[model samples]
Target: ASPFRLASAGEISEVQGILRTAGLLGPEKRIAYLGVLDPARGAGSEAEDRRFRVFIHDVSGARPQEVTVSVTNGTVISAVELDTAATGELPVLEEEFEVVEQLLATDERWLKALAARNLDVSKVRVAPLSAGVFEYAEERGRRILRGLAFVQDFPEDSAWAHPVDGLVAYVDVVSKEVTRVIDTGVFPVPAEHGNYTDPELTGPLRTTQKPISITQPEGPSFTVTGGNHIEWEKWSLDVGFDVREGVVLHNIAFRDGDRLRPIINRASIAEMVVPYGDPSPIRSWQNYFDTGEYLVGQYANSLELGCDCLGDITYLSPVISDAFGNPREIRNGICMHEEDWGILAKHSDLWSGINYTRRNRRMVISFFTTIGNYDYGFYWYLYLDGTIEFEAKATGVVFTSAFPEGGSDNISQLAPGLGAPFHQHIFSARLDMAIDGFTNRVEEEDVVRQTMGPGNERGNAFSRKRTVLTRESEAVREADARTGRTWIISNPESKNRLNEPVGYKLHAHNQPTLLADPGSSIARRAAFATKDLWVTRYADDERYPTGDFVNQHSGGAGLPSYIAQDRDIDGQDIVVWHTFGLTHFPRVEDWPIMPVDTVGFKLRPEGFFDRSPVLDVPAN
Candidate 1:
């Protein structure tokens, strides 16, 4: 019942036309993102006038503008010309990618660098990267993209495995010039083809494993109502999408008997930053904000039925705008299906010979996006036992550089000359939670051991200590595996049968946050990755962890700036931000294509329900 529906095709075209008529869309302007303007928190389930938010990248002016168009009234409501210096640059355009490649083709400097290595420019590929924040005056206040070279023996060969080490070029897209080129030294490119597609390259397929077919004779166990609304078993939620965040879940509720209990108001993977740990000059500025800077959703893979998902899959094609402001649909972009998740609960009695058990099934909603050489799959799962999980799978070609011929240091030697760099895939998940309602507060829970003298005469006395986080300043926290630390969001006004506040416990993986130096540019720009958990008072505009415009944003803007107010959070409508990720040290086995490195967190109902919610589930 919310105004969080995905923008329709008609709505997208209408907004673009409106902006065009308003003189916002020019020859040099392109649409960066287009989505429905999220209704304010507690704004009821209706809207008097529907509005859409449009992000336009003004390439000629080298700035981005945020425009809100009220399609119901057919006019622009407001416009904010974001200063690139303050809000950071918008994501690079698809056209700019082609432009950079063309600019490097004929450039004498770049050609000379390749000629010096005795490599043909025709056989090379250029990767366009966002020039990260730095103090370089020549590249300052201009639209810049860094180019990394990779050699390909053939057109279909994997370029990532043949990195042209120690060569970096800064291309100013606006000026159509290669502003600077840094060629430290040339290391021999690895001779490995690294092509997994051809049978000639991979040799043979595995015949040990037989094909397993999964069929659902009765069709899916879920119902799709009114297009984007999904209902499966006891769970009901709205599926929404954005150009930046991809899949968004809103107004999630669990049906308990006759009442629909609200769980989360909004949830999604907000932002992700991959910060490379290598100090090598070629990759030192390697932290890329995939969600914020690259707009991962725009690059969502068109998933295949049997390959991407299995067993009576339902697909939702999200329509996003292209660089030219035209609506483009990622066919079967978001996949929804049910997965058999082993046993939910089991009990056995010796004397009575009574055995009771229940099977667990989970509803999975997911999508995959390929940002440059890496592919990420984001999965949101809801279980029959009132558990929610957000899992991110990182796979694909590992970002690499050329290592010394024989051995390597500080990098994983994937081949003779190919070295995979160490990096962390830090993801920030925003949970605008409403346990039973919006008036909820957060508490830090830690397992504490009591002194033996006061609690027990022998030893082994432990209890849980929960501290209420009443204010924003007190809510910044990290996960502790030693103490079994967790954060619980509970509605103070709602109580369960045991008289405890209804709550959902957040379980983090407690992995490392931003391994970059504390004073580094990325450490400041991607500051939200520095903590495990952050609880802040809910604000409509505070959606992204790294701020709204994140292309080259200066640090201390999003979460850092929001928490500065330190507003009262106790019994207030608040949002929980959880940071979780995988720190990867690549191995030789990770070469060609890396296996899926999975990392995520879980939200289990602690006292929200009186007893097991899946008790009614039949064994069959």
Candidate 2:
């Protein structure tokens, strides 16, 4: 058979269609060309921009052959075959023995000197040897043996006796002793070099214009929607007029109405109900309230400071909720800073999750209410701050890699893998920001999350269960038991029995008669019964029940998809929400030093920014 088979005409046509759709066609439109040559070339530019290089190796025989491929254009660049067959074959045993003998002869003087002290040499036989290359001075004599080596009969079971390449002496086979040690004049030492210093390169964000003069309004005209919401009725400000060469900067702030906040408070709740107990208290409505209160307080303080310095801000209809699930709207004063308003909107009890993003001086926020186990909302904000800036927040238990496995029955069977087990837990979030001042508009986007250990045991447990269930089901069916009968159904009385004594245990040594697999009606029913019992006993409240919203929507938990599905709005980009019960195990060092739980989001910026805004800054 040919190593490279030719495709049929129909197959070739099909392949062509796929290639075309993938943009891998001829000339300028080719995928390879797209990666290498800058696609944004002006009408007449003669520049070949290469992206990457590739390398290939062929080690089918004794030596490896080298091949280089240019990833820039998917083209073969170079190839070379390494030849080593002419180096010569392994040395004959007699020649090797003769070489060893010559070395011993030169050390005869030392051997005779030792012989006078009762050292024997007639029974001496050259044994396995270690070797090293070193420079010797003309004045120095033969080297001395300073270490021990085994010297025994060359038994039939012995493997080949050979010298290692980086040592000083060889061992005698019969006497188990070391001899013929060579000492070169120079001592071994590692080479030293100067420390490396990275070149200073310009970062993505740079400002070329002088700080734009921002003036506070005579009075606080911005209205606070409530404790969490903010609504600004035409608070205009020039952001980059002086910096962007007289470009007018404009921004408008509005309350995000769709946001939902889920408050979690562990107080007044039993610790037994908490997820991943043994380290912290269980989650409760009270915990959420407390956290929300703290966050709100911070926002209020910041807003007041900004307002006192800027203008007389008024709180528009601020609504605050208590632990009793009652919300009171405050129709009093307003706050100044947008951050305070953003913070409140994110932590409101009405929202389950929130998402936010900004692009092209526009902000968007999305909020999800009637929160389900995995539902979310989002929002976006657009600011005239020279570059597009965005932020997001999440509510509920933001899953992290560090969370313990088996804490919740609702968690999917897919557990984390190995490597750094204790360090596999990761908390992920996203952000998208435009880089200012680039000839080509580029956006600086990052997705960061915390990491934790792997759940290898959980994964293995699921795998074993699946295998056992499959094997048992197969065996019962092959025996032609009643259709649908399974293990649990056949043993209904035993199904509900907890920690029951095993009448008989199956093991490799026993070779017990094969019973019907878990397929007969009895077997199937029995299995179902046992499963139901197990779930009731172990999974019960341990898992959060999936909500109706999650059932209606096929997308897995979280807020992004919900926001994307709502068609009534446009340009809304960011969402923010506060998560509760986000506690970590307290270590000795953590005392008197509370650690802040990190939180963030991911932003898609491929087509979001027009150019690299950061590049506009004058290069240093």
Candidate 3:
């Protein structure tokens, strides 16, 4: 049976109380994450409900303690201490962000540094960032956050428009102290308010734009049953919101006939890293693990009906734990709706005098999360043509720095003195494919050019070649865009009408991976982003790409640790991780507030069905 419901508020409270009694929660120990443990994750035949996974972080220590609780029986199932020294720091708590602002309130060193720049304390906002792994004396082995100051003219003005360049405060929230402050030469903060919302700042609204209304008078065609279970068109799946990966889709299946054909067991944007390219004193350590460190879903925006989503919308408010282990529901956290996808199939047969046109529509499941200066929208699209696509939309204010008279290659000058740096947002997607059943294999498909001397006498002949990824080591692959490269995860046990293995081909945007130097701290910490694809034998414990704990430690934890076994993956219960994203070399056009910049990939059916499955839809 598929256990598809999330833990209720009452259940969360009971579990937290039980964990407290079990000595797992206290004044110093905080619950980092608490959620329902998927039965399919492990436990074999004993797939029971009422089981929860909890991650606890100790303020005095760096390692995180992972505990599984059985709420029905009021018992702790299992508890394991994770290696944070090597794996990195534990997930930052939502409360910790507030703690830093208070910690720096009266610090002399931090105040003195700001005094030198003639910046007012009331006008400056400190962005609490994960103190990434560095060899600084004050940061080593410390659970701290790197605070970067940004100045604002008013309380409501955008602080990101005016960055206090070369100023950083290392505040150890655990100890409640500003351990050290570094001010590498002070530059004038940009004078621009960068207020895009105000009519006075951004001029008048566009009068040329007309209203486009999307109405569904008959209501939506999709049905939401059992809370998160969604059944729309040929798609059936459960929507999940995790503290780490944000939105996750589980038990994804497509209906072909009477049976709901299982395609993917689970899928999510496992982890994503934003590594900046500037090597400046303060900007060099700008690489951030947004999903892992900050817990993207924890900061999910409460979506609006007509603004964030449109048409006949269905929203699910998934409850998550606060830093204090309290139930917090983000109202309208997950938005589900159907979008008009232009064309599905259109053909005008001149010979037969028959015109065939079919409209395309797709079910969109999405949510937005804000991490300081950036806001990201994670969208999962399910089409009637058996295509699943994930698009990451980045907007909000760009992370700015104070530029001198002239801008260099590292930074793009937005205004007179404002600069947006070069950066890359690399994301890793975890595809727990259950193509037909469980046993599946991955094949790398690449278009190959034939020799001119062979059957191709005119050098016009080309063929496609498939290579099975037999081992974990061999499956760490990169995208060959020139060859039109793609990876196919096929079920050898299940065949189509043509006796071909039913599969789904993975398509990528084919952008650059991690641009940091090989030996750089960011590259090592975000090793999963260094490659485009990684295939591994399925293991429930190996959920995150950059390991469980990602904050402030050495590299080689998540994907690097999992693939060390070099296990054979062919015909086994396999999981495929594909890294795809955008490289932002910001321009003056992307200033103030960036328009939605989107990058994603697709998963299309490859002989999964005998023919096109959308012919049954009415032409209404």
Best by lDDT: 1
Per-model TM-score on C-alpha atoms: 0.98, 0.21, 0.96
**What TM-score, to 2 decimals, does candidate 1 have?**
0.98
List model 3 lDDT by residue over 1-620, tens digit each. 34667656887888888888998888877888777877755555574657888888887765668899988789999998876555566778877877776778699888888899898887778888888877776666668888888888887888888899988888888878888788898888888678888888678887998888998999898998888889999899999888788899998999899989999999999898899888787778887888888889888999988998987899999888876677878899999999899888988998999988888999999999998888999999999999999999999888888776655778888988888888999899999989998889999999998988867789888899999999998999999999999999999989999999999999988998888889988888898899999998988789988887788867767888899899989998999999987999887778778999999999999999998898897674
Cα lDDT of model 1 by residue, 435-494, tens digit: 998999999999998887855977777899999999999888987999999999999999
User: Using TM-score as the measure, what is the rank order of every candidate, best first?
Assistant: 1, 3, 2
Off by over 4 Å in 2: 1-274, 277-317, 320-327, 330-583, 587-597, 602-604, 612-620
Native-vs-model 1 lDDT?
A: 0.87
The per-residue C-alpha lDDT of model 2 at residue 441 equals 13
Q: Which candidate, 1 or 3, has the higher TM-score?
A: 1
What lDDT does candidate 2 reach at residue 341?
24
Whole-model alpha-carbon lDDT for candidate 3: 0.86
Residue pairs in candidate 1 whose N, alpha carbon or C atoms collide under 3 angstroms: none
Q: What is the lDDT of residue 41 in candidate 1?
A: 55
Clashes of each: 0, 118, 1
lDDT of 2 by residue, 1-620 (tens): 11111112332233334333433332322110000111222312534323211111111112322333333344444444333122111111112333443355346543553244332443233332211111223112221112211111233211111111111344232132344453322211111211112123123445665653334456433443312332332222212111001111122221112322111000010000012212111111001111110111111211232323332333222232221112333232222333222111112244755453322222222222111111122223333232122222333222111223344322211112100001111111111101110111111112223234375433432211111121111221111122221111011112112332111111111111112244322122112111110111111111111111110111232222222233211111211111112223333222112122322222222212233322232212
